[PDB]
Paper text:
In this study, we have identified a non-canonical ABC protein encoded by the rv3197 gene in M. tuberculosis, as a macrolide antibiotic binding protein (MABP-1), which confers inducible resistance to the macrolide family of antibiotics. MABP-1 adopts an unusual three-dimensional fold with a kinase-like domain and a linked accessory domain. MABP-1 is a homodimer with each subunit containing a bilobal kinase domain and an accessory domain. The accessory domain is indispensable for its function where it participates in dimerization of MABP-1 and in erythromycin binding.
Numbering used by the authors: 43 to 442
């Protein structure tokens, strides 16, 4: 096809762009130059231990043979692991990030998904982490003006999240407890958890990706509205956001509930959804700039002590304001595209953005999640009563 190609070309362009972003905002030199420095400044002897580790992963390429699945299970649940099951299907039904998923029946008769990590994944990912740590050290010491603050911590955190299934299992447990018997959301219970094996209740539904491709209008509207609701309900209900969203995370169940099956990106929100956001959107809708600008500055949504353009503020907030100006908003790719085109031509005026590029965490986290969700709503072509959801669930949005 000519579309596979275009998709991969877009992926390529995005990675190129992010590499350039890293060069300009982080590494303080081009990646090739940095690489030359790194190769000079990192011992040759570290090369082979790196390579070997990657190799143990390349071996036994997906899917894993039955024997090795069984070996991982031996390692995590003990050599008598079969006693935990009524039956186990050796043929995987799906692939995961660094493992594969099997369908099985638990000893209590419940159907379960069993995620098995690939045996070579731990060593490979930790070797990769070590290499990137060394490289960060090289940049910090030898690349003038490099900003690598928080980078090693982020790498360690991501690596640990990929390698230890128990973390996501705990997130999922919090959610499964919160949404037990909920009329609209279904979270499968964690049946067992180990670093390299995690087992949860099996649920059958229509994948959101399928609805995005071929869904009926009603399927699209329903699962989109459910996702929108989850987004604001979760921090209100249990002080967590489900986090960075991807259609693989969700499904539409026969009874009209949305199944949520992945919890790797759960984000902390102890105080709930910050009131400043809903407040800002309400004031912006009303074009009450006299109150809007101080509210935003106090919140840290715009830079302090600056001359700002209300036109730029409007542009900044329109993607949040336009959907709640009608009872039911039609989230479309066309609209999102319109939201990407700037109102202020820079040849007309050379202003410095009022936008906050150092958002406070409590704002940055939900805003990022919301961006991913909104993009998904547009892919769904979903009609969503976001106005009513916002009034009901988002602090500060309803007229006081």
């Amino acid at each position: 096809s000519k579309d596979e190609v275009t998709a991969e070309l877009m992926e390529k362009a995005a990675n190129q762009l992010f590499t350039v972003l890293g060069e300009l905002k982080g590494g303080a030199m081009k990646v090739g130059q940095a690489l030359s420095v790194m190769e000079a400044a990192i011992p040759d002897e570290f090369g082979e231990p790196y390579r070997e580790a990657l190799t143990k992963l390349q071996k036994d390429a997906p899917p894993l043979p039955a024997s090795k699945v069984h070996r991982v299970l031996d390692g995590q649940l003990g050599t008598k692991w079969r006693e935990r099951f009524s039956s186990f299907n050796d043929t995987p039904v799906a692939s995961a990030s660094i493992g594969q998923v099997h369908k099985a029946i638990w000893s209590d008769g419940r159907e379960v998904a069993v995620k098995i990590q690939y045996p070579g994944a731990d060593e490979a990912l930790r070797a990769d982490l070590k290499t990137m740590q060394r490289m960060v050290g090289v940049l910090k010491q030898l690349s003038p003006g490099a900003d690598v603050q928080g980078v090693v911590d982020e790498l360690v955190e991501r690596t640990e999240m990929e390698l230890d299934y128990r973390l996501e299992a705990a997130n999922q447990r919090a959610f499964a407890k919160a949404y037990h018997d909920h009329p609209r959301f279904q979270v499968p219970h964690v049946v067992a958890s180990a670093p390299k094996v995690v087992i949860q209740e099996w649920i059958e539904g229509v994948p959101m990706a399928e609805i995005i491709r071929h869904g009926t209008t009603e399927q699209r509207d329903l699962i989109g509205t459910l996702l929108a609701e989850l987004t604001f309900d979760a921090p209100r209900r249990l002080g967590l956001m489900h986090g960075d969203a991807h259609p693989g995370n969700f499904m539409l169940l026969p009874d009209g509930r949305m199944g949520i099956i992945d919890f790797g990106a759960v984000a902390p929100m102890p105080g709930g959804f910050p009131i400043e956001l809903g407040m800002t959107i309400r004031l912006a809708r009303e074009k009450n700039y006299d109150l809007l600008l101080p509210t935003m500055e106090k919140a840290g949504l715009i830079q302090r002590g600056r001359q700002v353009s209300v036109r730029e503020i409007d542009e900044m907030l329109r993607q949040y304001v336009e959907p709640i100006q009608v009872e039911v908003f039609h989230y479309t790719r066309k609209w999102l595209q319109k939201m990407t085109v700037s109102q202020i031509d820079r040849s007309v005026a050379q202003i410095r953005t009022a936008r906050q590029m150092d958002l406070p965490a409590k704002l940055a986290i939900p805003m990022r999640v919301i961006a991913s969700v909104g993009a998904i709503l547009c892919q769904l072509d979903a009609h969503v009563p976001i106005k009513a959801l916002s009034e009901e669930l988002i602090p500060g949005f309803a007229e006081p």
